Amino acid sequence: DVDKRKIKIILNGEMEEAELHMITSPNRHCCLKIFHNNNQLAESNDTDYFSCFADLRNQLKNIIFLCKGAKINVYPSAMSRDMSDGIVAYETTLGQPGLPENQVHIFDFEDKYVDITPEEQRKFHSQWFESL
């Protein structure tokens, strides 16, 4: 299966439009590609698209991704990762378990709290998990 999604990015300070390709193949293989100006800037291969996206953002350190999956407080639950191939995640809040109304699509638009690295996102998530 191949799905495509246009996204907004900030490349070296400039607002730009890019296109993600999600290629889901047999044996849990998720391939996430990003195209910009018809050129493939990067690709990640993993078993879910949230992991793919974190790898992609680490490969492209000069780009801010204006997407929910790049937001500091967003992370999949085990269930959302497993059942949705990482496409559905949660916006998390200090001291609170995640609720259905907190669910998001990782490639929906977001421009707040996204100028952060995948490692900072993992750190926020670890501190959140400990806050419960």
């Binding site: 299966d1 799905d3 889901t24 849990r28 078993t47 879910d48 949230f50 992991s51 992370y75 639950s77 085990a78 269930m79 959302s80 990762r81 497993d82 059942m83 949705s84 191939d85 496409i87 559905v88 949660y90 378990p97 995640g98 609720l99 259905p100 669910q103 998001v104 699509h105 929906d108 993992r122 998530h125 670890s126 998990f129 419960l132």
Partner: protein
């Protein structure tokens, strides 16, 4: 004691009724599963007691159609009971299946469209 649980999944029932639900890694640590089941990949298949909790996942947040599978098993771990108030997504009513779910334990597959509408017909697994 056996219980019915449900799982959203985009994979075909031809594949699932044949192979069942397999896990992605060997970690048996339920705490690590709840924190991040990709780091390390956990030896559990996630399911829920509540069929409605599968819909947003099966449809990728209303973007595509997918399936809700039903299964009957006796080896699952009730995540909320095991983790208590620490359960990070307790509203999901998660029963984590250690080692996955055999194909013979899967009852059927019911399609759901992107708008969240469950189809009328459930496709039953002939292995039952």
């Amino acid at each position: 004691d056996y219980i019915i649980t449900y799982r959203g999944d985009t994979r075909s029932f031809t594949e699932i009724f044949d192979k069942g639900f397999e896990t992605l890694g060997p970690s048996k640590d339920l705490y690590k599963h709840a924190l991040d089941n990709r780091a390390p990949p956990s030896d559990f298949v996630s399911t829920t007691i509540d069929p409605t909790k599968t819909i947003s996942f099966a449809t990728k947040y209303g973007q595509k159609s997918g399936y809700m599978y039903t299964m009957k098993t006796n080896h699952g771990i009730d995540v909320n009971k095991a983790l208590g108030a620490r359960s990070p997504f307790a509203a999901e009513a998660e029963i984590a299946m250690p080692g996955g779910v055999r194909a013979e334990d899967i009852l059927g597959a019911r399609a759901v469209n992107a708008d969240g509408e469950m189809w009328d017909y459930t496709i039953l697994n002939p292995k039952r």
